[PDB]
Design a protein around this nucleic acid. Sequence first.
RNA 1: CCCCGAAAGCUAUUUAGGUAGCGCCUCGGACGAAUACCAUAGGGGGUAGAGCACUGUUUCGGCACCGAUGCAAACUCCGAAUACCUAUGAGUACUAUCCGGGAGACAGACUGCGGGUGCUAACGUCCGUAGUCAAGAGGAAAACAAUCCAGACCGCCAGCUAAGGCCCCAAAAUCAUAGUUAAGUGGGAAACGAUGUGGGAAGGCAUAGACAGCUAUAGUCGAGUCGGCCUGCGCGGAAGAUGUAACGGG
Lengths: 38, 142, 57, 97, 76, 137
Amino acid sequence: MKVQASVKKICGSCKVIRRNGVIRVICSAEPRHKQRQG
Amino acid sequence: MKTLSAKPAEVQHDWFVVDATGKTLGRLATEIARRLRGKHKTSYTPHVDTGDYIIVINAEQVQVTGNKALDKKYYRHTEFPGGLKETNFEKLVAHKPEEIFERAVKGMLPKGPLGYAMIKKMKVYAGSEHPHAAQQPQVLDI
Amino acid sequence: KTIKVTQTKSSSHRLKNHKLCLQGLGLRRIGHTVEVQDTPSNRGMINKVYYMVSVEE
Amino acid sequence: ANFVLNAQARAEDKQGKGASRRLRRESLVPAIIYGGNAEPVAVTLELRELVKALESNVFFEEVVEIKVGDKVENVKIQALQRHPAKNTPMHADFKRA
Amino acid sequence: STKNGRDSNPKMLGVKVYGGQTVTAGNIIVRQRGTEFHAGANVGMGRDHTLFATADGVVKFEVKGQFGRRYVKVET
Amino acid sequence: MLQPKRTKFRKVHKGRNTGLAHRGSTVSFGSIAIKATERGRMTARQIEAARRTISRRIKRGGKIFIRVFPDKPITEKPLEVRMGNGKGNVEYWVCEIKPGKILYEIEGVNEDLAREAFALAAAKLPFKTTIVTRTVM
RNA sequence: CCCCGAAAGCUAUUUAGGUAGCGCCUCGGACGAAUACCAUAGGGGGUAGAGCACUGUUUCGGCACCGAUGCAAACUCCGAAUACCUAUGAGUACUAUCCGGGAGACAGACUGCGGGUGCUAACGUCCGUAGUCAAGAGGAAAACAAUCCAGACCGCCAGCUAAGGCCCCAAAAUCAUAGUUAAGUGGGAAACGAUGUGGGAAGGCAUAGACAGCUAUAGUCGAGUCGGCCUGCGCGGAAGAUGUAACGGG
Ligand SMILES: [Zn+2]
């Protein structure tokens, strides 16, 4: 999990979602692309 | 000396009962404080207690809006170093419903001996029963 | 041919020429009303202190 | 014919700095029309219509028509002013053709 | 330590009498380092380019001549 | 590090930065350009960094026009020095930026590559920018 | 007890926390429109802005010059608003000026505007200009010389308003009509990031059937869908020491 002020899609398998007022990125292929804005 | 002050020996206190089911906390508290202080009587005097007795029933059914059920915080300090204690509304309403009303009405009454005397006239009960049948309270819808 | 001017605000902190314009029109206090001739010379003083007078034209 | 702009007269009480700023706050554009044998005429234009016309390239080389009610003028674009930072058109000149 | 910190005393130059005013003979009209204004009728020039009136009258400024020089004169 | 070859004076007053840029706000040399939207100061190092980024991205396939030059010197005190005792020493050179001023122009590339290079460059600058293209008027 | 009422500036000083002349206060005498505010008329300027004609400086081409393109406290082909000087004039006002008796003061402060210096730091320092304090009480900003409103002769258990306000502490609307926000945002903070929601101007494809999903572009279905620009209000970025402690509290 990466925690940064800027979160973006990396590949075509990343999806940007919103949970409980937090913007996250979840990737279907590689777990290392997982991100959380913070 | 033509404007007269109310005489404490001539003040009549009346008994009312209020049901708190589904009411907003602060908007009920303002009216309760008004009637405790006596602002609704034409003989109102700032240095004399002229208010009425208010019984509150179903105290654990009071409501708050937004996210205040989980996010509103209650603090106290035991005067030992590091002694700050914290709770929230939803635990406090389950545990001690009367202290919520005590805090809310105490914040709106004056701070002094007269205010301490005024707040003695409010009786808060969690359930739907009160032990003051002998005083024959009247139903008040505020 | 004559107009009525009423002072509506205080003149204590104003500029010196503005105070002198009020004194030259004859206004002495808040709520004072005077009646003056309708001439360009009077109109200049009125227009300079427009923001604290009321004109009944 | 192909390019037509509906316009309304801009009067003396609508001319000036504050008046022009109020017009632009109402989303309008001031314009002037001058040319041979007639006095200048001041008019007001629609911002969206002007932007749509400026997007096309033939607008700058073809005779355009400005209609203020019954009065009709045939003119060419002569000069345009834009805001330095936002690029919004601010004033237009039209030379009679 | 700075090498600056000097300046000279003020000299009080400029126009002393403006257009439309009345003068008497001897009144100084302009103080000037160079000849920014030139002497017209009834106006004399001193050794330091000062312009003064040589007769009573009214001061008047103008622009005249083939070089566009500024002139001041006195009308009696 | 752009800097004038010689100057008439060494130290200049601070001044104030006011107004808009009515001059230098039109694409003249190239076809696409980047321009500032708010005011500020631009240093020679910032100019060099943005130029290097643009040139590296476009791989020197077109021509880059730089329209800002840092002709204003800025002084500083030597540190641990008290107030007074003269003006400081020149440290670096800046250019004053007003809203609407065009910084860089590019000639001879595709718009997608020019925009990607401009986006790369805009991250090195201390003020907001925007992209413009040439127009008849 | 009654009346008026400053200054913390300039110049010089073995002078810098002293003093002297002038400026500012007061009292007496002389003399009244010679004074000021505003209108009209006359007048010089080189600042703001702007520009490249000079002095410097700047980028790209062509051949120091030529074509485009920028910059300047000690550059100017230009050039205001205000300020300043003079004359005439209505109205309002104990105004102006001259001669004498007595002084105090010559450590200022903050706020706004134009600037130098400093880091476009400081409740920093040095100038110009206006207001307040100094020497000024009352109401508002929780408390708060210098901010906002307003200038206290004395008395009244009368009335109208200013700034600021009208749920309770605590005087007055739980007033009325339309919208926005879900963050207790309101009631601290940036670059940047994001299908959060409201509004606006255009564009692409589409019931000879559009987007997604699914079967190997066709094909099952049955109306919208797609990607940008401008804009209102919100979200993250956001860590500190005694006690909630960044709406005065409820
Ligand atoms: Zn991925």
